[PDB]
Ligand binder design. Sequence first.
Ligand SMILES: *[C@@H]1O[C@H](CO)[C@@H](O[C@@H]2O[C@H](CO)[C@@H](O)[C@H](O[C@@H]3O[C@H](CO)[C@@H](O)[C@H](O)[C@@H]3O)[C@H]2NC(C)=O)[C@H](O)[C@H]1NC(C)=O
Ligand SMILES: *[C@@H]1O[C@H](CO)[C@@H](O[C@@H]2O[C@H](CO)[C@@H](O[C@@H]3O[C@H](CO)[C@@H](O)[C@H](O)[C@@H]3O)[C@H](O)[C@H]2NC(C)=O)[C@H](O)[C@H]1NC(C)=O
Ligand SMILES: *[C@@H]1O[C@H](CO)[C@@H](O[C@@H]2O[C@H](CO)[C@@H](O[C@@H]3O[C@H](CO)[C@@H](O)[C@H](O)[C@@H]3O)[C@H](O)[C@H]2NC(C)=O)[C@H](O)[C@H]1NC(C)=O
Ligand SMILES: *[C@@H]1O[C@H](CO)[C@@H](O)[C@H](O)[C@H]1NC(C)=O
Ligand SMILES: *[C@@H]1O[C@H](CO)[C@@H](O)[C@H](O)[C@H]1NC(C)=O
Ligand SMILES: *[C@@H]1O[C@H](CO)[C@@H](O)[C@H](O)[C@H]1NC(C)=O
Ligand SMILES: *[C@@H]1O[C@H](CO)[C@@H](O)[C@H](O)[C@H]1NC(C)=O
Ligand SMILES: *[C@@H]1O[C@H](CO)[C@@H](O)[C@H](O)[C@H]1NC(C)=O
Ligand SMILES: *[C@@H]1O[C@H](CO)[C@@H](O)[C@H](O)[C@H]1NC(C)=O
Ligand SMILES: *[C@@H]1O[C@H](CO)[C@@H](O)[C@H](O)[C@H]1NC(C)=O
Ligand SMILES: *[C@@H]1O[C@H](CO)[C@@H](O)[C@H](O)[C@H]1NC(C)=O
Ligand SMILES: [Ca+2]
Length: 955
Amino acid sequence: FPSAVTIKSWVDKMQEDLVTLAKTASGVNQLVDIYEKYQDLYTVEPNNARQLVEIAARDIEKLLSNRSKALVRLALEAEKVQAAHQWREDFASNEVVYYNAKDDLDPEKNDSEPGSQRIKPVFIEDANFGRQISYQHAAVHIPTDIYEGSTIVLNELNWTSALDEVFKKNREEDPSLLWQVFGSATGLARYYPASPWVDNSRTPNKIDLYDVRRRPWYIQGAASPKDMLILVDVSGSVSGLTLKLIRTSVSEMLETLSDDDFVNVASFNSNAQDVSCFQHLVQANVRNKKVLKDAVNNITAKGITDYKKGFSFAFEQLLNYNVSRANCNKIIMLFTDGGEERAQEIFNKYNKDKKVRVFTFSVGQHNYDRGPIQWMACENKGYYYEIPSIGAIRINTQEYLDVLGRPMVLAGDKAKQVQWTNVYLDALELGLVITGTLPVFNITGQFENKTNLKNQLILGVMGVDVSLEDIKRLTPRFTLCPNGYYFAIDPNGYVLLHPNLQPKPIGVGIPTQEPVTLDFLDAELENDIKVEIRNKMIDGESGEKTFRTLVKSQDERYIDKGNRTYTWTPVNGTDYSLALVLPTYSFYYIKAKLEETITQARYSETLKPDNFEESGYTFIAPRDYCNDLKISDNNTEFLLNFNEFIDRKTPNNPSCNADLINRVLLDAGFTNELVQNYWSKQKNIKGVKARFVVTDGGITRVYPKEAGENWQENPETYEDSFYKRSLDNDNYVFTAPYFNKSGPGAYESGIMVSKAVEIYIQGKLLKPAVVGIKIDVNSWIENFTKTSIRMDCVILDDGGFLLMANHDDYTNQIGRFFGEIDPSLMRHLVNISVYAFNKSYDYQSVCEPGAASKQSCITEQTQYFFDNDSKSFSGVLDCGNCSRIFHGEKLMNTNLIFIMVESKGTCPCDTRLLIQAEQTSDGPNPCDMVKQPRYRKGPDVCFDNNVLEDYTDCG
Ligand SMILES: *[C@@H]1O[C@H](CO)[C@@H](O[C@@H]2O[C@H](CO)[C@@H](O)[C@H](O[C@@H]3O[C@H](CO)[C@@H](O)[C@H](O)[C@@H]3O)[C@H]2NC(C)=O)[C@H](O)[C@H]1NC(C)=O
Ligand SMILES: *[C@@H]1O[C@H](CO)[C@@H](O[C@@H]2O[C@H](CO)[C@@H](O[C@@H]3O[C@H](CO)[C@@H](O)[C@H](O)[C@@H]3O)[C@H](O)[C@H]2NC(C)=O)[C@H](O)[C@H]1NC(C)=O
Ligand SMILES: *[C@@H]1O[C@H](CO)[C@@H](O[C@@H]2O[C@H](CO)[C@@H](O[C@@H]3O[C@H](CO)[C@@H](O)[C@H](O)[C@@H]3O)[C@H](O)[C@H]2NC(C)=O)[C@H](O)[C@H]1NC(C)=O
Ligand SMILES: *[C@@H]1O[C@H](CO)[C@@H](O)[C@H](O)[C@H]1NC(C)=O
Ligand SMILES: *[C@@H]1O[C@H](CO)[C@@H](O)[C@H](O)[C@H]1NC(C)=O
Ligand SMILES: *[C@@H]1O[C@H](CO)[C@@H](O)[C@H](O)[C@H]1NC(C)=O
Ligand SMILES: *[C@@H]1O[C@H](CO)[C@@H](O)[C@H](O)[C@H]1NC(C)=O
Ligand SMILES: *[C@@H]1O[C@H](CO)[C@@H](O)[C@H](O)[C@H]1NC(C)=O
Ligand SMILES: *[C@@H]1O[C@H](CO)[C@@H](O)[C@H](O)[C@H]1NC(C)=O
Ligand SMILES: *[C@@H]1O[C@H](CO)[C@@H](O)[C@H](O)[C@H]1NC(C)=O
Ligand SMILES: *[C@@H]1O[C@H](CO)[C@@H](O)[C@H](O)[C@H]1NC(C)=O
Ligand SMILES: [Ca+2]
């Protein structure tokens, strides 16, 4: 065992060698002084985060107010044109002409109902929607389980033509509108841009179960937030088919509860108990709904019924005010079959002011008495539903929600307020959208008062979709550092907008149409400062906060010790709150002063893929430079069209943004001046395998043009993990290649090395680019084993990944996590606390399904980093019945640590492994997360318990 000073100087000499090689070949200084050499070619401008947040909040509120105005127009016209409708029973004499969405494109003259003539439209391909779109009329969706020629459906299809016309008007005053739709309460759905239904028109194994009245936006706009409590009657008499139907019905009832709704499930048989681990009303989000569904699926029937001990439990759990709730619409859902017990005194004791509804469901095919079941609904403002078989399950849930909207109708114009739903995946696939709803009231008898029989029910709900990518375009991101970004938030803390929000459903457990509800604390790493910021944003305040944050790298494999500054404002007129993350060095950006029309041309000439031998292999970020350019995943295609458009650019002045092209051309020119005046004068270094420079404008020219085929970084520089990592870290960062990845690999590509330029203009810190070297593995291993005369030696970077070693069998598994190699040293070296680790959760990850294609689960990813700042570490590894010695030295001015451990093939301490990998897991235990739930602000105004409501419709 060499002494500490010997291997200390050893590490010092390797770090001197590596730093000198990287600094020379990379040419940080040459790119720097090129950047300061042309201060007359640009201007440095500030990123006033306060004004940026205010501007983006104003823009988003303007967009949402535009959609609100569209909704108001549509709802007013719907009410007016249904008020003046004449009921009919004969449509043979007067056909209704409409386009049915699930019509085959074949010119079939025989696909018409008696009372309806079908339109055959001319479908154009549209860029906004990505489907066939006809602007000449609205399309109609009628569920399969609903006949499309009955009297109700035919009358609705008759009076919705004015809706069609107002659809046209709305789209004519605002060409950016997406799907705008009337969700009828008869089952129909009439959206304006006529497009064929998704895949379910006529396709085997593609059945169309879509029903507009179950959709989250319809569920949301049809009533006010609930406080359910599903009483399931698991007694003896419900065994067999009845219990199957009850558990399916409870699942389908839970599938109609939003995140503003609170629900628990109880079950009684001579004794009432909770079916799950929850002891009170919990929020009805995806995780809690799954827990309740599992508990209901795991339920068995036994014992004698007792309707008094069950309703006592229900009324007691609805009297709990210690927990978070939505103090509104208290309900009891009784899932029984029948009995001769009315329990008058329980109701008279607990529900005497009749503050709580009771919806009773007589599930099953049986001959038990159904009188008390129908009476509990009458004396408690409820309604009585029957579920004789699966297939009747879907319709009755929509129907209690039909009942709950009576108090909302009676409040004439105080109940017509626009509400936006959680981020969900559109049916007519558009990606991620939020829908703004407004309910439509039946106003036939009004100011000419008639019997007004069913004037307490809504006609439907009008929705208009806002694309999430449409919100993303109101928050311009390219004037910020690749580490700076915007994000918005719900009142529940979910993110309207965030870089880590992907168009995938939220995972809920282990694999074996829910909304994309991703909390703010789960889209990032969670400190306590971030909990304070989240609570401040939910309340709708404004403020600033500068602090130190662990910023996880994009590749989800490292953690860096960042330096952030959150500024937030509420978006006026809505429930959303916008914030802007901004690094401390990102307060200034370079504004390209390209107005010569010739300098930009001599910059542009560098970009055709015919000069890729004096200038490096060029990739361009597929940004929206001009709208006539379509971004392409195949990058060289986009480069070709970019060159083509640059060839004739001058007349396209208003067609596109000048700033992006000016900056990208300026950066291309600077990169060319670097690659010729410093890289083309040398042409060859033994150690290097590739020299690259990546710039925020989009230029990522890699020099040799040979490793450019081995280059696997994203063309858009703002999504380059190493580029974002190297800006926060003001030092050299080595990115260990991927292990066991099918492709160019590591030997014939090298290992990535990078440092970020740190130029100063007017005494301001701004970092416009990164340079780097793809050091070859052999040219390092020879130099590492060259000095061995002056075996177990390993090099580790941040995250504990083996960059390279000496045993020559570890170098076979290069880049692989060191804990997978010898986990005992990994655990011990963590125990010294040189490597801290953070374990977090990824709710939006694809997942291989096991046993009890790929589903989505919650994966539990961990990342390691330098816990302490100390440089020298020594100790003894107390292996089981043996002893091992190590010394650790962190190379100065890099992210590396050298471990001098001398022990191979000793007694087996390889009991387990430290597998730093995206491990499949269950999420946090929900039974423990509902007792300290995250802060959350419920909706303010809700409508229940009106005195004009006519309860004599128990059905
Ligand atoms: C292992 O291989 C060679 C060993 O010679 C390393 O390169 C040498 O690194 C030392 C570090 O201190 C330099 O002095 C050697 O010469 C230098 O060359 C540069 C070239 O620009 C000059 O500017 C310097 O002034 C100095 O003369 C250098 N020699 C060569 C031929 O590169 C090599 O970096 C190392 N392998 C790895 C992967 O780092
Ligand atoms: C909105 O409310 C109005 C009234 O509040 C509804 O119109 C009424 O609908 C009923 C059907 O439920 C009509 O009764 C029917 O009349 C025909 C012909 O007279 C008869 O053959 C049927 O057996 C049935 O009795 C009623 O005439 C009609 N109008 C009025 C003034 O009551 C309307 O249906 C509601 N909106 C929707 C979308 O349902
Ligand atoms: C994620 O990684 C961070 C790395 O900073 C972890 O934060 C650190 O956690 C340790 C363990 O709790 C904290 O040490 C504790 O400090 C308190 C206060 O001095 C002391 O009383 C305890 O005995 C313990 O030593 C450490 O302070 C904390 N770092 C900071 C900056 O606060 C974090 O725990 C990891 N996990 C998660 C889920 O964040
Ligand atoms: C929102 O309204 C408040 C007070 O009405 C105002 O101070 C703030 O500047 C407004 N924000 C925006 C973005 O208009
Ligand atoms: C809102 O609509 C007006 C005209 O109807 C339009 O000028 C404006 O650009 C729209 N706002 C947004 C954010 O698109
Ligand atoms: C209802 O049907 C009649 C007869 O076909 C038609 O004249 C009327 O315009 C229809 N209503 C609407 C709102 O189009
Ligand atoms: C839940 O399922 C397990 C496994 O089938 C079973 O042992 C347990 O009894 C079930 N829970 C209840 C409350 O019956
Ligand atoms: C709520 O808290 C009070 C006092 O902390 C306690 O007496 C009561 O038992 C708790 N539970 C309910 C359901 O009120
Ligand atoms: C940002 O970094 C500097 C030095 O790199 C440090 O002094 C400062 O405290 C950091 N910011 C915060 C908010 O701690
Ligand atoms: C990309 O586009 C270019 C230009 O048409 C073509 O030569 C190349 O084969 C394409 N590559 C891929 C992978 O599509
Ligand atoms: C280190 O290991 C010891 C025993 O092996 C354990 O008690 C301790 O919790 C571990 N972690 C730290 C930080 O000491
Ligand atoms: Ca019974």
